[PDB]
Amino acid sequence: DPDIFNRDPRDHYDLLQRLGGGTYGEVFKARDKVSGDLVALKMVKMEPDDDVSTLQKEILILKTCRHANIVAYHGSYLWLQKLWICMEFCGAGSLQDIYQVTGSLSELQISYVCREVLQGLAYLHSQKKIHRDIKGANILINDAGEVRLADFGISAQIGAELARRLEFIGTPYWMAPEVAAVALKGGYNELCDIWSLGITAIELAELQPPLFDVHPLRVLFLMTKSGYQPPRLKEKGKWSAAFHNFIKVTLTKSPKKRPSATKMLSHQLVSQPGLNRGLILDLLDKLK
Amino acid sequence: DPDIFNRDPRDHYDLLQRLGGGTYGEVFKARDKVSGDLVALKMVKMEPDDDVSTLQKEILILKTCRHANIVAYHGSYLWLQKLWICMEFCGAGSLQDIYQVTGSLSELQISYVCREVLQGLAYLHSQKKIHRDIKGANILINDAGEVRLADFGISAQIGAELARRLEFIGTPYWMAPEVAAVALKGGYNELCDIWSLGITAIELAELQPPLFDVHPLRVLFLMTKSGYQPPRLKEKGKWSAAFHNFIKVTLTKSPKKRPSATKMLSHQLVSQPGLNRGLILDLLDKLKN
Ligand SMILES: CCCn1cnnc1-c1cccc(N2Cc3c(cc(N(C)C)nc3CNC)C2=O)n1
Numbered sequence: 001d002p003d004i005f006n007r008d009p010r011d012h013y014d015l016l017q018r019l020g021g022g023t024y025g026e027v028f029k030a031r032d033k034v035s036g037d038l039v040a041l042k043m044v045k046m047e048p049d050d051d052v053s054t055l056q057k058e059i060l061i062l063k064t065c066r067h068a069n070i071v072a073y074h075g076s077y078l079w080l081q082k083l084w085i086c087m088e089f090c091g092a093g094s095l096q097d098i099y100q101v102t103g104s105l106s107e108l109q110i111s112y113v114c115r116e117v118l119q120g121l122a123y124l125h126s127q128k129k130i131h132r133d134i135k136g137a138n139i140l141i142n143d144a145g146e147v148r149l150a151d152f153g154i155s156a157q158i159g160a161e162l163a164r165r166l167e168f169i170g171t172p173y174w175m176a177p178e179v180a181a182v183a184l185k186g187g188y189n190e191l192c193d194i195w196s197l198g199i200t201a202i203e204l205a206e207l208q209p210p211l212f213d214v215h216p217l218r219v220l221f222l223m224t225k226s227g228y229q230p231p232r233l234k235e236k237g238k239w240s241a242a243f244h245n246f247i248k249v250t251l252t253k254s255p256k257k258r259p260s261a262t263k264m265l266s267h268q269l270v271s272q273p274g275l276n277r278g279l280i281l282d283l284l285d286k287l288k
Numbered sequence: 289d290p291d292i293f294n295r296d297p298r299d300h301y302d303l304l305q306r307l308g309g310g311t312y313g314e315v316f317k318a319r320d321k322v323s324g325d326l327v328a329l330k331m332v333k334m335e336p337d338d339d340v341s342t343l344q345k346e347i348l349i350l351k352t353c354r355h356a357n358i359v360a361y362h363g364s365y366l367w368l369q370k371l372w373i374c375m376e377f378c379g380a381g382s383l384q385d386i387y388q389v390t391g392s393l394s395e396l397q398i399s400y401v402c403r404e405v406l407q408g409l410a411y412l413h414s415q416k417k418i419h420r421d422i423k424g425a426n427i428l429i430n431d432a433g434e435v436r437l438a439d440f441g442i443s444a445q446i447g448a449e450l451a452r453r454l455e456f457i458g459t460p461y462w463m464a465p466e467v468a469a470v471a472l473k474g475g476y477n478e479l480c481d482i483w484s485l486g487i488t489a490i491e492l493a494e495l496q497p498p499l500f501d502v503h504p505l506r507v508l509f510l511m512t513k514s515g516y517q518p519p520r521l522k523e524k525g526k527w528s529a530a531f532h533n534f535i536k537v538t539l540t541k542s543p544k545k546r547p548s549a550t551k552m553l554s555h556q557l558v559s560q561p562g563l564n565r566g567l568i569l570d571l572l573d574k575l576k577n
């Protein structure tokens with residue numbers, strides 16, 4: 001990263017508590033030694049022998065995002081084989097941290113979260129970025145009740161992998177166009193995020209994604225079977241027709257028929273005039 | 289592997305000549321100390337901490353092939369951080385080695401090679417195997433003028449890659465079905481080899497594949513564009529309508545419409561009589577004289 005701080009952030013911050021992991025690295029809550037401002041520091045072990053591509057892509061994504069629904073980026077430090085990504089501290093943690101305490105979210109709270117995530121996704125997709133890891137654990141809530149997408153580790157790993165593989169995929173001159181297409185584009189597109197959002201909406205309503213207790217490898221196989229049916233909400237009577245329809249359309253099996261983030265923003269569920277931060281601030285009130 | 293020889297291959301063979309590289313490793317001409325038979329030994333560096341999955345997959349591909357048009361497999365040796373794969377030796381080298389001396393092949397010579405490669409591809413595809421690196425450099429010729437496909441390095445790497453990637457692709461519960469599909473199936477199928485054969489037929493005719501002067505990364509981009517026109521032979525009048533048609537159909541852009549290896553074996557260009565190894569023996573006489 002051209003803007004890296006070649007200094008130890010511990011000279012400027014006190015590490016207060018561990019905030020868990022993620023795709024890679026350890027996240028800490030940190031307080032500025034003088035200002036008192038709180039930040040999240042994601043520490044990753046570096047080495048002169050280690051490939052910097054993944055971290056380089058993650059920093060590039062975060063630094064070029066300037067949107068209210070994407071975690072803010074403050075800079076990165078490099079000192080004594082440790083890289084520290086400095087980001088916005090989100091006081092309420094992830095939606096998973098929240099629902100594990102409060103129980104299932106109400107339909108209005110899920111509708112607001114969905115609107116906010118779709119705003120973030122519409123922005124990412126407009127910058128030709130794909131999150132590829134949407135789930136309750138990657139949707140953060142700050143004390144202000146703001147919804148922020150986080151952890152671009154999978155997105156960074158995918159992008160770095162696609163670029164790294166190119167040298168070894170073989171000679172392009174004799175390559176079939178469909179092989180070149182998967183080499184450059186990966187075999188899918190940004191609409192994979194829309195599906196993940198539909199699953200996240202079931203997770204917020206039910207406290208688990210569909211097939212949560214099934215071995216992760218068997219899930220992959222089940223999903224590729226020709227008979228695979230998109231998941232549905234379990235408690236039909238609890239939810240409005242708009243919510244069932246939101247699940248139906250975001251979980252469109254064919255990606256050619258699945259609606260874009262911008263199209264989804266006009267959906268009846270997420271375009272309700274009454275959706276506001278008050279819904280989340282209420283959720284944080286229950287947390288206390 | 290319980291079939292590997294845990295010994296120096298020089299106990300059994302004398303190394304005679306360097307035969308170049310390939311996708312990975314170095315190949316040598318060798319002579320069996322007991323029988324005097326010639327073989328090719330491919331030596332690959334294999335450290336104790338290195339991933340064995342690619343080489344395991346290459347030997348599995350080779351060992352379960354029993355078809356004249358695929359180099360025979362004799363066995364493998366592991367010794368002093370080197371893995372040696374023992375295969376059939378092909379006395380005239382690759383078609384690329386040959387045409388760099390002889391110049392362009394004749395249409396009958398091309399037809400015979402295409403038939404032979406198609407027979408090997410029909411067999412591979414019958415086993416759910418994909419070559420994925422068909423080109424003149426990988427079509428080997430023996431002193432009898434017989435044709436063998438070689439170098440499953442790319443095929444082995446793709447197979448090892450699919451299995452290795454799986455653990456790191458992220459949680460599956462929130463994943464879109466198309467993400468899971470590409471993770472388990474790859475994104476394309478065996479018909480990629482039919483396209484590669486068509487490009488190879490142009491290569492044998494013109495001494496290089498289409499777009500060879502273009503930067504390889506730019507070639508990848510050009511092929512991914514909607515509107516990419518499949519390439520054609522340059523000199524229209526020099527080639528029969530049958531040969532131009534063979535190129536047109538093997539280079540069908542949509543893989544859903546591209547014919548199989550078995551389908552291509554019924555094409556008049558490769559089903560014509562007079563297609564035999566004597567055509568390549570003529571080519572080898574040109575190489576010598
Ligand atoms: C995807 C989250 C990790 N991550 C992976 N890449 N960038 C980040 C990242 C980025 C910015 C903030 C944060 N976090 C995470 C977190 C936070 C607070 C908190 N509280 C107050 C209980 N809990 C947790 C998480 N608990 C399990 C917080 O500010 N994380």
Ligand SMILES: CCCn1cnnc1-c1cccc(N2Cc3c(cc(N(C)C)nc3CNC)C2=O)n1
Nearest residue numbers: 307308310328359375376377378379380381438439
């Ligand atoms: C396909 C490329 C190598 N390879 C990669 N995986 N398996 C193999 C492989 C397997 C079996 C034989 C052979 N070869 C290659 C070769 C030969 C002879 C020869 N002569 C007499 C000049 N020249 C060359 C190649 N020259 C550039 C021969 O028998 N190779």
